[PDB]
Each structure stands twice: as structure tokens, then as C-alpha cells.
Amino acid sequence: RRKTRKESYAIYVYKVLKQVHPDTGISSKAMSIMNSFVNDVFERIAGEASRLAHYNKRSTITSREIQTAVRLLLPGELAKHAVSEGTKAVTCYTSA
Amino acid sequence: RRKTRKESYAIYVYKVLKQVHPDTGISSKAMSIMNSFVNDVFERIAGEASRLAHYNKRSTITSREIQTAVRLLLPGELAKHAVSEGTKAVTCYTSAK
Amino acid sequence: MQIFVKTLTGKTITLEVEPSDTIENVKAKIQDKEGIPPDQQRLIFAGKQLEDGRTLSDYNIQKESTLHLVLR
Amino acid sequence: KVLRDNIQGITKPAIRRLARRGGVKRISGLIYEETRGVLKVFLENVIRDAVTYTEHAKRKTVTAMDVVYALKRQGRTLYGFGG
Amino acid sequence: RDNIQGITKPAIRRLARRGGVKRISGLIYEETRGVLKVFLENVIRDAVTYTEHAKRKTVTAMDVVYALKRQGRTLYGFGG
Amino acid sequence: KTRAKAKTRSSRAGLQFPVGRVHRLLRKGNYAERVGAGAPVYLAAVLEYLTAEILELAGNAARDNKKTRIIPRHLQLAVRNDEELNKLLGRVTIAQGGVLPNIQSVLLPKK
Amino acid sequence: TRAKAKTRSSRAGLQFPVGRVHRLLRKGNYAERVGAGAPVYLAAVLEYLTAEILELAGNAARDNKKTRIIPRHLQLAVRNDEELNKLLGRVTIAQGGVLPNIQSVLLPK
Amino acid sequence: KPHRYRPGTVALREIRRYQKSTELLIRKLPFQRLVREIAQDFKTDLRFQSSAVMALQEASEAYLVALFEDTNLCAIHAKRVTIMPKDIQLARRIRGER
Amino acid sequence: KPHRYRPGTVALREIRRYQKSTELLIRKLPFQRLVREIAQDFKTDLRFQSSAVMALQEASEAYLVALFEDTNLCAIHAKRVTIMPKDIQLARRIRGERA
DNA sequence: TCGAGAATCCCGGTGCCGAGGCCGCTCAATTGGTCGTAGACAGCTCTAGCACCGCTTAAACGCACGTACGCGCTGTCCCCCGCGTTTTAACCGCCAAGGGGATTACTCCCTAGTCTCCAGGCACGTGTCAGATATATACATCCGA
DNA sequence: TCGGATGTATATATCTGACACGTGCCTGGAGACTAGGGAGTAATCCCCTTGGCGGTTAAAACGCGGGGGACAGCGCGTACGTGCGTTTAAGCGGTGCTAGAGCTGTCTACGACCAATTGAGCGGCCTCGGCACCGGGATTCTCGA
């Protein structure tokens, strides 16, 4: 008689928060707001990448499409830092 | 010489124009503008229908999704007339075979 | 004169009519030779809807003209 | 039960409080009717969109998700209520 | 390269006259030039990003339309 | 085993726009997994109705100015003067269009 | 035999689920095929943005001698930074409020 | 003899007080009644969830606050302190609404 | 005595004449050179199709005309006839473009 | 009030280039048939949305008083507008050269799909402390003499 | 320029409801393997972009006279802010009840996929009529007396 499973991003947001500020909690409404923010941003980036891939007569999305979509969406400093972070993560994953 | 084929709604637009006004021409720029307009409306309606189908966790796009998307996008009088025309066309297609 | 009326099923019938003949006369002859009631005859020639009050000469419907008919 | 004349429920002090939060210092005597009309138009649009959304799903109860989707469709998305 | 000066005062006057202005002050021109520069910079940046992703050397008319459409400023009649 | 004569799907629905092309574009457009058999008819009818309305208004406007061809100015004049269509194309600019001839009342000369 | 399983996020050194992002991309109807590098990039970008916003909100809350984070702190953090405000220019946060500013003309002589 | 403040001080006090807090301003029950009366025109015998009403109230409050800010700016632009309906009309017209 | 019109008549005549027609209003060569100079910073050794330049010109002209209309309304609201930079600033601030 | 100059529109004649139409053909929409599963309908369970009733008290309402601000009116000074003369570079036409866009063929490898297995994230239940209230007190600020 | 009265900030006890954490488990993610088409790379063609030179002519630039508009200053009276007593209904706490949202079976009609084929739509050519352009006269405006 238990309910169904609802996926969320609470555990990862809590992990990041504890990584940044080790002695600070968070209430429920802030968690809901952060969840909505994450979903919104994911949707925007994915849609832009899909349109970009369709534009150039391709049938797949790779890291290049994500990088270009990130450069298009975010403003300057955010775009630069996010691009550096994504490239570093991809290189570290490939090396292992 | 090899030339790739390009698709357009030019012939259908011309057919509609000759159906409405028996004696009236059209230049190339107007044809291009009408082609762009048709593509834009098609894209908007199709995207709205796709999102609406995805909201209700279904995997098929039917006439009901198209009708709801049309009612959502177009304003009142245009929505009413478009709904009537679409219903009539679908009924005519179904009855015949 | 002789005019051609093409139905929805792809059939063309011949009407021995006159330019002065009204569209209602065309409908009556079509009903006589095919059985299609005049109220169910929807007619176009030269892109103009045909009205029973108007004549064939009004729409410049001459001999060997091609007319389109809908029974919907 | 059919309900009439509820637009007057938006009292003058409530509009004054909203204006105070907005930063207004002096208020004329004819603002209230204009504010009521504007709010009525806004609610009409949003409610129409939400009702269409809940109609498509063959339901009879408007949920918060329908309101969120209707608000987003007009480019004034809202955070903190799911989705 | 002070090419922003190519937008002469009579050109701005003609644009304002088409808009419907009857009297013009003597300091509108600098503001108009700055606004036009900002708008052009944004649009050209987006178009150049599109072209770079496409891996080409000459910008086309299509990516200009795409960049304009991204900012909610759709344009009709240029092969869209 | 004699195949019947081919009939276009647009012919059965009494339309002018191509049903098959719309069906193919819907299938290949990455909108959903599967597409029903009635959506293209509805979409074609809607597009045809909108095109007919726009073209009728533009033709009237062109006939007003004693011309036998349609140019972008006529399309702009047709679109901007109907509140419904103007609301539809709110954020769209038409090339070589121009503006509506209006002037503010106060700017007019006194007496 | 078989070797023990190691999550892809651990290999990439992240805190966001790479596999969940890959599944969402596959089932989201975005393209016919999805490469093996997009999920890592997406997860890294999302983690960076979340960390930035959370740090700013925590600072704002600690300025008000509190130990937990409420929506007002998030609103203050978002609206007081230029790029973040630009990114969320058309978003309203529930229970947020406004910024305390007053036009200079209305001030007393 | 009774102590009375000069006209304007209390207005600034309320400005600061209501810019410091975050609670809702409109009452709940009249707003719910208004929402139901408006929705009655589209489909009879409808039912609502409470969160839907709360979301509608939040959105409407935010919209009204932004509109009042723009109206105040328009009023200040023309050498005035008092806001008037023409300011609201001008702000709505420029914003791109009909 | 030479025949002179009162100040304002020629302005209305120009309004009617230029708002009746549908041509462009800025010289092509200076605009093309300005576009090239602006785009030079983002990437070196670029090339342009003519239709791209035409599209950019059309969009810029439309934007400027709309901005001028809004500015004229803002000027008229404050009991004046001559537009001023503060009017442009107020219109841009209300439109949500300027931060 | 009235008449002399300018700017605009209607008419006629002439010439050019692009819009409407015809042929040929190649690829995409049709037709006929098979197969697997997406969803429509029926049934059942439990929650949360609607309705009523009582009490308390905080907020809305109406009225009186005074004052500061919106608005009309007048005067000054100056700065855009209309017009004439001189200077310049935009535009059209023509001629040359080559770099990069658009196809076509070939091949390695990257991803979808299947099976097997196990551990990570979610629903559930519990303790305790961060903060919201209540009470009292000290301090900053406003308005009149 | 001081000083009285009011509102706001500051310090302390306290009690509660939400946050953080420990389990069980079961479904989703990971490991190993195959097979097949999408994408990278090399070679070729030729089309469109860039560059240079002469003229010619319309548009840009510069200077001057002046009249209408922006702006500051002044007076008035009227609508709006502030405070007090009175009336109203919102808000909280319970208690009932049932319409309808949500989950499980099942079974059939509908959409995906494949092979043969044939008529619709696109590229190339051309031809001639609608619209652009020039000259002339009638008309409709504006400003001084």
C-alpha cells in the first residue's frame, strides 16, 4: 500500500551544499526551488542542443553541441567557467 | 551539372490564391514570405502538440493533441473557425475510403 | 450549346444548354439526366460560384465549357 | 452556487499596501478601479489557459501543475510549486 | 577606424521622421549611435558563434536569421 | 491481382495542401515516437485556412491600390489592420514592409 | 568472474548522476542517438551553477545570523548579482519579496 | 495639543515596513471567491486544489507589484509625486500589452 | 522678399513623404563597413554574403523606428514636443532592455 | 477676411525584364500484407475537497480637519529650423583572380541492443534543538518653542 | 538652535514542530559481447567573393537670420493624509461525508515495417505583358495684407 517512487535532486543538492558550507542547513521550500531551477536549466540546454544538431543535418548530439549551446545560453563569465569545468570533467573521465 | 532539389509550399499557395481571387498575380518576395509564415506556424503547432503529449505520459500524437494545441495558440475567432475546418476535413477523410 | 459538367467521381456529363439558360435550368437538366437534386448541386466555372438567378452567359459559360460539380 | 460581485472584495487598503511595497508615496483617488480591471483581465487569461489544460486530460479538478504550465506558457514561469 | 561616424545626422533625422517625430534635440545622435552599436554587437556575436560551430569561414544569411530568432525578433522573407 | 489506380490522400479529404508531405515531416521531426493517422489532415486544413485568410485580405488591399500583383507592402497593410492577425504576428518583422500612416493629434497645426 | 562496479560519476569525479542524465537524454526525444560525452558535460555544468548559487545564498543567510536557508536568502543572492539576475530575468520566486530601494526625490528635504 | 505627524512620514514608514517583509497582502477568502466566480464562466461544477489558488495569488501579487513600480517611475518622470491613471496606461502601452 | 515657410510645415511634409514609402534610409557602404569593423573583433579573416548584410540592415532599421515611436510617446506624455535623451533612457528602462 | 507662389496628382506615351507556362524525368508517396503492443474499458480503494457551526478580535468603514501640491498664467532668452553655397564620396559599370563551398567515394569504429547481476536511492519512522513568542528595557528619531 | 514623546532595536526564558538520520529492499544501473550504419577523410569542380579604376551627380557639410518653445517664478484652492470611534467578517478549531483521483487486468484494434511501381513535383527555356519612367498640365495647399 506504499506510494510510487518520485525521483528528485535533493541528495545531490545537499551534498554540494555540505561541500561548500559545512555548517549550514536548508529548508524544504528552498530545496523545491533549487529542484525547479535545475530542471529548467537542463531543459533549456537540451532543447538548444537538439535544435543545433538538427540545423546541421546530423543525427546525434555530442560534447561539441553541448559546449556550443552552453556558450550561446549563458553570459560571459559563467560561460567561460562552465566551459572550463566541462572540458576538465570530460578529459578526466576519458583518461581513466 | 548536378542540382539538389529544394522543397517549398509555392504551388499550394498559388492554388489557394487562384481559388480565392481568380485574377491576381504574386511576386517572388511575397511567395518567400508566405513560405516562411507557413513553416513558422507548422513548427509552433507541432512543438506545442509534442509537449502536450509528453505531459500526459503518452507516446502517440493524434488529432486531439492537434485540436488542443490549436485552441491554445490561436485566439478566439480564429480558433473557432480553424477547429470547425479541421473537424470537417477529418470527418470527410474518414467517411470516404 | 453543349457544356461539360464533371462530377465528384470523375464522370463528365453533356448538357445541351444555351448561354441565356439560367443555372437553375442547368440544375434541372442535370437532375433529369442523372438524378442529382438541384439543391445538392454545387457548381464552379472560371472560379465563380454559379447562382440559379444568373444565366450561363453571365458566367461566360459557352459551348464545350468545363464545369465542376460537388454533391456534398 | 452561483456567486455575484466578488471583485469588490479587493479592498482599498489592500491596493494601498501593494502600492506601498511597490514604492509609491502618494496615491490618487481613481487608481483602484483601473487596478481592479487590470487584475481581472490577467486572471481571466490565466484561468482560461489552466481550464483548457485540465480539460484535455479528461479530469474535473484543477491541479497546481496546470496553473504552473499555463503561467510558463506566457513567459512568466514560477518556481517553488513542482515541475 | 571611427566608422561609427558613417551614420550621418540626416540619416538619423530621416529615421526619426519616419517614426513620427517633429522636433529633435541636439544630443539624440550620440544615444542613437550607442544603442545601434550595442544591438549590432549582440546580433553579430550570436551569428559568428553559429558560423564557428558550423565549421566554415564565411557567414551565411541563414545563421543571421537564426540569431535573430533566438532573441525573439523573428524575420520573414530571407530564406527562413 | 490488379492494383487500383492511385489516389492522393489530399484528394479524399478535399484539401489542397499535401497530406503525405506533412505526415513525413511529422514523422521525421522528432516530435513523438509514433504519429496517428489523423493529425496530418487536421494540420493541413488549419494551414490552408490561415493561408486563405491572409491571401484574401492581401488581395483586397492590392485591388484597392489599382494593382494586379501582391507585393510585401500589401501583405503588411493587410496584417497590421486586423487586430486578430496583428495579435498573432506580434513579434515578427516583415522585410520591405513599412509602417501605418498615423500622426499624433497634438502635433497638428493650430487653426 | 566479474569485477566490482564503479559509478561513472566516481570516474568523472563529480557529485551529480551521469547515468540518470544519460537516461533522461535518451528518453527525452531530443535526437536519434546520444553520444558518450554529453552527460558528463551536462552534469559538470549543472554542478557548477548549483554550487555558485548555493554559496551566494549561504553567505546571504549567514549575514543575517541564521543557520538555515529560506527562500528570501535565495532571492537576495540572485537579485544582488549581475549575471545571475540576467539569467533569471523572467522568473518569480515564491515567498521572495523585493529589494529595499527608494527613489531619491521622495526623500524628505 | 495632540501629537500629529506631518504628511508623508507615515507613508515612508509603511514603505520600509512592507519592503522588509515577505508575507502576502491580499486576504485569502475574497481572492478564492473571485477565482471561483471567474472560472465559473468557462465550465460549471469545477473543483480546485488549494495549492493552485496559492500559486495564482503569488503570481498576481508579483505582477501587480511590478506594474506599480513602473507606474511610479512614469509618474516621477513628469515632475510629479502623485500617481495617476494615465501613468498606468502609458506603462501598459509601452510594455507591449493591449 | 523670398518666400519662406513657417517652422514646422516642412517637418510634417517630410513625415508624410517618408512614412508613405518603403525604402531604406541609410547608405549601404558605411553600414557594410561598420558591420565588418564590429565583426572583426570576434574572429579574424571573415567573409560575408550580401544577403546577410541586407538582413542586418533591415532588422536594425526596424528596431530604431520602433524605439523612436516609443520615445515620441514618452516625450508627449510630459507636455513637450521635442524628444530628449532622458526619454530614450526611460523607454529603454521600461522596455526591460537596459538593466 | 482675400490672392500669389510652390508642391502634388492625373494623364499619355514608351520600353524592359521577370512571371506565368510548357517538357522531361527521377525519386517519393501508394498499395497490399504481417505482426506486436498502447491504450481503452471495467473494477476497486482510499483521500481530500466541500459544507456547517461556533467564537474571538483584528481589520475595514465613515467622518472631521488642515495643508501642501497640482495647475493655470506670465515673462525671458536661446537654440533648432528653413534656406543658400560649396565640397565629396556613393554608385554604377567594367574587368581579373582565386579561395572556399558543395559533391562523391571509401573505410574504421562508436553506439544500440541483449542478458545477468547487485547495490544505491526512496518510503518509513523517530528524537531533539533552531527558532518563533512573549516580556521587559534601552536607544534613535521627529516636531514644536 | 533644544527637549518631550513615540516607535524601533536589543536582551532573555521557553516550548514546539520540522530537520536530520537509521533501515529494508527492490528496481534501475553496470559489466561483457555483437553487428551495422553514421561520420571522418581525401580528391575534385567551379561559383561566388574580393579587389581595382573612372565619372557623374546627388547628397553631405557649413553659415546665418529669427521666431517659437523650454523653463523659472507666482498664486490659489482643492483633494488627500492622519487620527478616532464604530461595525463587520475573516480566521481558527472541530465534525461529517462522499465524489473522484489513482492503481490493476485484459484484450483488441491500430501503427510500424517491407517490396513493387507509377504519377506528382522540380529544374531548364522562353515569351510577352504589367509596371517603371519621362513630359505636361490641373489641382490643392500655405503665407502676407
mmCIF file of N, CA and C (backbone and C1' of nucleotides) in Angstrom, chain I residues 3-7 9 27 32 36 46-50 79-82 84 86, chain K residues 48-51 58-60 64-71 141-145:
data_model
loop_
_atom_site.group_PDB
_atom_site.id
_atom_site.type_symbol
_atom_site.label_atom_id
_atom_site.label_comp_id
_atom_site.label_asym_id
_atom_site.label_seq_id
_atom_site.Cartn_x
_atom_site.Cartn_y
_atom_site.Cartn_z
ATOM 1 N N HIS I 3 10.251 83.802 -50.363
ATOM 2 C CA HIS I 3 9.108 83.121 -49.770
ATOM 3 C C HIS I 3 9.604 82.011 -48.851
ATOM 4 N N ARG I 4 9.287 82.118 -47.563
ATOM 5 C CA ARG I 4 9.705 81.147 -46.565
ATOM 6 C C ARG I 4 8.490 80.580 -45.844
ATOM 7 N N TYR I 5 8.565 79.297 -45.512
ATOM 8 C CA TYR I 5 7.520 78.639 -44.747
ATOM 9 C C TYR I 5 7.785 78.798 -43.257
ATOM 10 N N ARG I 6 6.725 78.695 -42.467
ATOM 11 C CA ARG I 6 6.881 78.761 -41.025
ATOM 12 C C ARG I 6 7.531 77.477 -40.513
ATOM 13 N N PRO I 7 8.271 77.541 -39.407
ATOM 14 C CA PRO I 7 8.927 76.333 -38.882
ATOM 15 C C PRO I 7 7.911 75.282 -38.466
ATOM 16 N N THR I 9 6.122 73.181 -40.955
ATOM 17 C CA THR I 9 5.406 72.668 -42.118
ATOM 18 C C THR I 9 6.234 71.630 -42.864
ATOM 19 N N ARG I 27 22.842 54.776 -46.007
ATOM 20 C CA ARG I 27 23.713 54.419 -47.118
ATOM 21 C C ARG I 27 24.324 53.041 -46.898
ATOM 22 N N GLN I 32 27.896 48.647 -44.303
ATOM 23 C CA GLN I 32 28.676 47.434 -44.522
ATOM 24 C C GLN I 32 30.035 47.536 -43.850
ATOM 25 N N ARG I 36 31.523 45.165 -40.810
ATOM 26 C CA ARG I 36 32.810 44.480 -40.900
ATOM 27 C C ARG I 36 33.712 44.835 -39.725
ATOM 28 N N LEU I 46 37.234 37.093 -41.764
ATOM 29 C CA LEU I 46 35.880 36.632 -42.027
ATOM 30 C C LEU I 46 35.425 37.086 -43.408
ATOM 31 N N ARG I 47 34.355 36.459 -43.886
ATOM 32 C CA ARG I 47 33.745 36.819 -45.155
ATOM 33 C C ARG I 47 32.236 36.846 -44.983
ATOM 34 N N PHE I 48 31.566 37.626 -45.825
ATOM 35 C CA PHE I 48 30.145 37.888 -45.673
ATOM 36 C C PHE I 48 29.416 37.674 -46.988
ATOM 37 N N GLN I 49 28.220 37.101 -46.902
ATOM 38 C CA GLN I 49 27.295 37.110 -48.023
ATOM 39 C C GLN I 49 26.482 38.398 -47.999
ATOM 40 N N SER I 50 26.138 38.895 -49.188
ATOM 41 C CA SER I 50 25.448 40.180 -49.277
ATOM 42 C C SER I 50 24.086 40.132 -48.593
ATOM 43 N N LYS I 79 4.154 66.664 -21.568
ATOM 44 C CA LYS I 79 3.764 68.008 -22.002
ATOM 45 C C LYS I 79 4.902 68.721 -22.729
ATOM 46 N N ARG I 80 5.437 68.080 -23.763
ATOM 47 C CA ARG I 80 6.501 68.645 -24.577
ATOM 48 C C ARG I 80 6.288 68.255 -26.032
ATOM 49 N N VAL I 81 7.148 68.786 -26.897
ATOM 50 C CA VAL I 81 7.140 68.427 -28.309
ATOM 51 C C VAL I 81 8.481 67.893 -28.791
ATOM 52 N N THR I 82 9.586 68.219 -28.127
ATOM 53 C CA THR I 82 10.921 67.847 -28.575
ATOM 54 C C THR I 82 11.435 66.672 -27.757
ATOM 55 N N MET I 84 14.134 64.123 -26.057
ATOM 56 C CA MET I 84 15.359 64.354 -25.308
ATOM 57 C C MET I 84 15.948 63.012 -24.901
ATOM 58 N N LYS I 86 16.739 61.738 -22.062
ATOM 59 C CA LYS I 86 16.089 61.111 -20.917
ATOM 60 C C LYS I 86 14.861 60.319 -21.340
ATOM 61 P P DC K 48 26.879 31.215 -57.729
ATOM 62 O "O5'" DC K 48 27.297 32.264 -56.602
ATOM 63 C "C5'" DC K 48 27.655 31.797 -55.315
ATOM 64 C "C4'" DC K 48 28.934 32.455 -54.838
ATOM 65 C "C3'" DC K 48 28.832 33.962 -54.588
ATOM 66 O "O3'" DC K 48 29.043 34.233 -53.210
ATOM 67 C "C1'" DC K 48 30.839 33.379 -55.735
ATOM 68 P P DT K 49 28.548 35.620 -52.570
ATOM 69 O "O5'" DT K 49 29.902 36.321 -52.095
ATOM 70 C "C5'" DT K 49 30.800 35.622 -51.247
ATOM 71 C "C4'" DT K 49 32.222 36.112 -51.446
ATOM 72 C "C3'" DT K 49 32.426 37.607 -51.200
ATOM 73 O "O3'" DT K 49 33.173 37.811 -50.012
ATOM 74 C "C1'" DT K 49 33.600 36.822 -53.149
ATOM 75 P P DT K 50 33.382 39.297 -49.437
ATOM 76 O "O5'" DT K 50 34.711 39.812 -50.162
ATOM 77 C "C5'" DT K 50 35.952 39.188 -49.883
ATOM 78 C "C4'" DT K 50 37.023 39.637 -50.862
ATOM 79 C "C3'" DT K 50 37.372 41.128 -50.811
ATOM 80 O "O3'" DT K 50 38.730 41.293 -50.432
ATOM 81 C "C1'" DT K 50 37.161 40.343 -53.050
ATOM 82 P P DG K 51 39.294 42.750 -50.058
ATOM 83 O "O5'" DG K 51 39.808 43.341 -51.453
ATOM 84 C "C5'" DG K 51 40.949 42.775 -52.085
ATOM 85 C "C4'" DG K 51 41.176 43.388 -53.456
ATOM 86 C "C3'" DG K 51 41.186 44.919 -53.492
ATOM 87 O "O3'" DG K 51 42.486 45.384 -53.822
ATOM 88 C "C1'" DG K 51 39.956 43.978 -55.319
ATOM 89 P P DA K 58 21.632 64.461 -60.084
ATOM 90 O "O5'" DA K 58 20.988 64.045 -58.685
ATOM 91 C "C5'" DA K 58 21.019 62.686 -58.280
ATOM 92 C "C4'" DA K 58 21.666 62.541 -56.915
ATOM 93 C "C3'" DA K 58 20.930 63.245 -55.776
ATOM 94 O "O3'" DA K 58 20.771 62.353 -54.689
ATOM 95 C "C1'" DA K 58 23.215 63.872 -55.791
ATOM 96 P P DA K 59 19.682 62.646 -53.547
ATOM 97 O "O5'" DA K 59 20.551 62.667 -52.209
ATOM 98 C "C5'" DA K 59 21.507 61.646 -51.985
ATOM 99 C "C4'" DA K 59 22.698 62.181 -51.218
ATOM 100 C "C3'" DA K 59 22.359 62.831 -49.874
ATOM 101 O "O3'" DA K 59 23.124 62.231 -48.842
ATOM 102 C "C1'" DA K 59 23.814 64.203 -51.135
ATOM 103 P P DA K 60 22.698 62.419 -47.306
ATOM 104 O "O5'" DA K 60 23.959 63.145 -46.647
ATOM 105 C "C5'" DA K 60 25.239 62.532 -46.699
ATOM 106 C "C4'" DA K 60 26.340 63.576 -46.661
ATOM 107 C "C3'" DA K 60 26.373 64.431 -45.393
ATOM 108 O "O3'" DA K 60 27.608 64.259 -44.711
ATOM 109 C "C1'" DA K 60 26.560 65.773 -47.365
ATOM 110 P P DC K 64 28.309 83.184 -40.507
ATOM 111 O "O5'" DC K 64 26.794 83.668 -40.658
ATOM 112 C "C5'" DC K 64 26.294 84.022 -41.940
ATOM 113 C "C4'" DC K 64 24.801 84.282 -41.891
ATOM 114 C "C3'" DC K 64 24.297 84.924 -40.601
ATOM 115 O "O3'" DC K 64 23.299 85.872 -40.915
ATOM 116 C "C1'" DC K 64 23.139 82.919 -40.977
ATOM 117 P P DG K 65 23.127 87.199 -40.030
ATOM 118 O "O5'" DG K 65 21.547 87.420 -40.005
ATOM 119 C "C5'" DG K 65 20.805 87.326 -41.211
ATOM 120 C "C4'" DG K 65 19.376 86.903 -40.937
ATOM 121 C "C3'" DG K 65 18.748 87.520 -39.695
ATOM 122 O "O3'" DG K 65 17.414 87.895 -39.974
ATOM 123 C "C1'" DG K 65 18.691 85.154 -39.529
ATOM 124 P P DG K 66 16.605 88.828 -38.951
ATOM 125 O "O5'" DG K 66 15.603 87.811 -38.238
ATOM 126 C "C5'" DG K 66 14.869 86.883 -39.022
ATOM 127 C "C4'" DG K 66 14.144 85.888 -38.141
ATOM 128 C "C3'" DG K 66 13.549 86.474 -36.860
ATOM 129 O "O3'" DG K 66 12.263 85.934 -36.649
ATOM 130 C "C1'" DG K 66 14.898 84.637 -36.338
ATOM 131 P P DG K 67 10.952 86.822 -36.908
ATOM 132 O "O5'" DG K 67 9.759 85.819 -36.565
ATOM 133 C "C5'" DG K 67 9.702 84.554 -37.205
ATOM 134 C "C4'" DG K 67 9.637 83.427 -36.188
ATOM 135 C "C3'" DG K 67 8.636 83.630 -35.052
ATOM 136 O "O3'" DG K 67 7.984 82.407 -34.783
ATOM 137 C "C1'" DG K 67 10.755 83.201 -34.157
ATOM 138 P P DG K 68 6.415 82.376 -34.450
ATOM 139 O "O5'" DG K 68 6.237 81.017 -33.634
ATOM 140 C "C5'" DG K 68 6.711 79.803 -34.188
ATOM 141 C "C4'" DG K 68 7.489 79.002 -33.161
ATOM 142 C "C3'" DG K 68 6.700 78.588 -31.925
ATOM 143 O "O3'" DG K 68 7.068 77.276 -31.560
ATOM 144 C "C1'" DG K 68 8.606 79.780 -31.266
ATOM 145 P P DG K 69 5.994 76.279 -30.906
ATOM 146 O "O5'" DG K 69 6.831 75.542 -29.763
ATOM 147 C "C5'" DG K 69 8.072 74.942 -30.084
ATOM 148 C "C4'" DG K 69 9.050 75.050 -28.928
ATOM 149 C "C3'" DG K 69 8.502 74.626 -27.568
ATOM 150 O "O3'" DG K 69 9.448 73.797 -26.925
ATOM 151 C "C1'" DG K 69 9.466 76.769 -27.416
ATOM 152 P P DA K 70 8.969 72.634 -25.930
ATOM 153 O "O5'" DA K 70 10.031 72.709 -24.741
ATOM 154 C "C5'" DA K 70 11.415 72.657 -25.038
ATOM 155 C "C4'" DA K 70 12.234 73.349 -23.965
ATOM 156 C "C3'" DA K 70 11.914 72.938 -22.535
ATOM 157 O "O3'" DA K 70 13.119 72.813 -21.804
ATOM 158 C "C1'" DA K 70 11.624 75.281 -22.776
ATOM 159 P P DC K 71 13.139 72.069 -20.383
ATOM 160 O "O5'" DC K 71 13.228 73.273 -19.342
ATOM 161 C "C5'" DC K 71 14.119 74.348 -19.594
ATOM 162 C "C4'" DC K 71 13.789 75.531 -18.711
ATOM 163 C "C3'" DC K 71 13.311 75.165 -17.303
ATOM 164 O "O3'" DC K 71 14.189 75.722 -16.342
ATOM 165 C "C1'" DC K 71 11.952 76.855 -18.276
ATOM 166 P P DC K 141 -6.181 70.022 -50.152
ATOM 167 O "O5'" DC K 141 -5.014 70.442 -49.142
ATOM 168 C "C5'" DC K 141 -4.863 71.802 -48.752
ATOM 169 C "C4'" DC K 141 -3.448 72.288 -49.008
ATOM 170 C "C3'" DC K 141 -3.024 73.469 -48.156
ATOM 171 O "O3'" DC K 141 -2.422 72.998 -46.958
ATOM 172 C "C1'" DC K 141 -2.333 73.731 -50.455
ATOM 173 P P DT K 142 -2.415 73.914 -45.640
ATOM 174 O "O5'" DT K 142 -1.281 75.005 -45.933
ATOM 175 C "C5'" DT K 142 0.070 74.598 -46.111
ATOM 176 C "C4'" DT K 142 0.962 75.795 -46.387
ATOM 177 C "C3'" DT K 142 0.897 76.902 -45.338
ATOM 178 O "O3'" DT K 142 2.189 77.453 -45.122
ATOM 179 C "C1'" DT K 142 0.292 77.775 -47.443
ATOM 180 P P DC K 143 2.210 78.332 -43.778
ATOM 181 O "O5'" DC K 143 2.378 79.841 -44.327
ATOM 182 C "C5'" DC K 143 3.669 80.257 -44.835
ATOM 183 C "C4'" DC K 143 3.539 81.616 -45.481
ATOM 184 C "C3'" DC K 143 3.313 82.770 -44.505
ATOM 185 O "O3'" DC K 143 4.050 83.918 -44.914
ATOM 186 C "C1'" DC K 143 1.528 82.670 -46.060
ATOM 187 P P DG K 144 4.009 85.030 -43.755
ATOM 188 O "O5'" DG K 144 3.532 86.360 -44.535
ATOM 189 C "C5'" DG K 144 4.426 86.958 -45.506
ATOM 190 C "C4'" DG K 144 3.666 87.968 -46.330
ATOM 191 C "C3'" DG K 144 3.211 89.208 -45.564
ATOM 192 O "O3'" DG K 144 3.210 90.347 -46.418
ATOM 193 C "C1'" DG K 144 1.318 88.008 -46.327
ATOM 194 P P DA K 145 2.926 91.668 -45.551
ATOM 195 O "O5'" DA K 145 1.405 92.044 -45.936
ATOM 196 C "C5'" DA K 145 0.931 91.756 -47.275
ATOM 197 C "C4'" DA K 145 -0.282 92.603 -47.570
ATOM 198 C "C3'" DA K 145 -0.505 93.758 -46.600
ATOM 199 O "O3'" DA K 145 -1.167 94.838 -47.251
ATOM 200 C "C1'" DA K 145 -2.255 92.177 -46.369
#
